[PDB]
Amino acid sequence: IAARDLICAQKFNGLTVLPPLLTDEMIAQYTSALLAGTITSGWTFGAGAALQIPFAMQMAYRFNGIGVTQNVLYENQKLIANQFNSAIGKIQDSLSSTA
Amino acid sequence: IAARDLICAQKFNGLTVLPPLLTDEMIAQYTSALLAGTITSGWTFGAGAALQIPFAMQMAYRFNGIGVTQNVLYENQKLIANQFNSAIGKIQDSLSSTA
């Protein structure tokens, strides 16, 4: 159900993140909301164009999620790199001593 | 040619993915289509505002591509991690036995 995307959106300790994986009904509802907002923007003078707010909200949430996942992956790669370097150095030293 | 982006868009076994790398003419055509859609939304009552559909379609495709690439990278990192752990354990055991 695409309606349970915004009302049940996960968050972070100080931010809000969402996975970048969409669905057919999800993008269909997004396009319908965007079309409704663009239609109401041309016939309303007040705050009737507020239908495009949740679209940008979920877009920013997915962007923040992608960013934090990229940061986690970068930290994990740095950890793996330094651990591999230290292990290879120690193994080389041990092999030289044994030889 | 930016026109060969939507008509020659790759897909997946059950989804549709696109690389997040854009170009100058690509973003120019996207902005032109968005402006045309926003102009037609204010002067048409029927389905004339359908010019913003391919924009959201390619956006969702790029999001799904980023998501599946992130998932592949996460699986690869998990594989590398467990393989490194097992190899380091076996190497430590062999070195202890040899010593």
From Swiss-Prot, chains A, B:
Entry superkingdom: Viruses
Protein name, per record: Spike protein S2'
Function: Subunit of the fusion protein that is processed upon entry into the host cell. Mediates fusion of the virion and cellular membranes by functioning as a class I viral fusion protein. Contains a viral fusion peptide that is unmasked after S2 cleavage. This cleavage can occur at the cell membrane by host TMPRSS2 or during endocytosis by host CSTL. In either case, this triggers an extensive and irreversible conformational change that leads to fusion of the viral envelope with the cellular cytoplasmic membrane, releasing viral genomic RNA into the host cell cytoplasm.
Protein's organism: Severe acute respiratory syndrome coronavirus 2 (2019-nCoV)
